[PDB]
Amino acid sequence: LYQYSLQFFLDIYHNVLYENPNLVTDHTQRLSIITKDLFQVAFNRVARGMLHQDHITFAMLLARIKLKGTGEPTYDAEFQHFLRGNEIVLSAGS
């Protein structure tokens, strides 16, 4: 039901970078402001046209993206066990 385009992502660029609220005038803090605003606006625009069931899934995916971008060590093994380890084969008679 939701197909998004690179033109849509460029539109969200034009709507985040240009008309960024409170236009800090410092090259260090403006980067973090632009980053946080881009994540939040991306979540808002994508969630406008998708179901409340999948809202949390998209939010968790964005949390994973923020963990990958940050410095914070991503728990790749734990994430993979949470994703695919729910259907893992178990021992016989366990």
């Binding site: 539109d11 709507n15 625009r45 969630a47 046209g49 409340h52």
Partner: protein, 48 residues
């Protein structure tokens, strides 16, 4: 995600975000229809 619980700022979205050549897809589950919402929006904005 607190913005999502609020009702849509449809006037702001159609005034700023929506390009003139991009249609506004008002999708709905059965039992729901947003045509009345668009009529109310047009009544507010005084647009033919």
């Amino acid at each position: 995600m607190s913005i999502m619980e609020q009702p849509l700022d449809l006037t702001h979205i159609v005034g700023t975000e929506v390009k003139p050549n991009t249609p506004v897809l008002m999708c709905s589950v059965p039992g729901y229809d947003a045509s009345g919402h668009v009529e109310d929006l047009a009544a507010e904005q005084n647009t033919q």
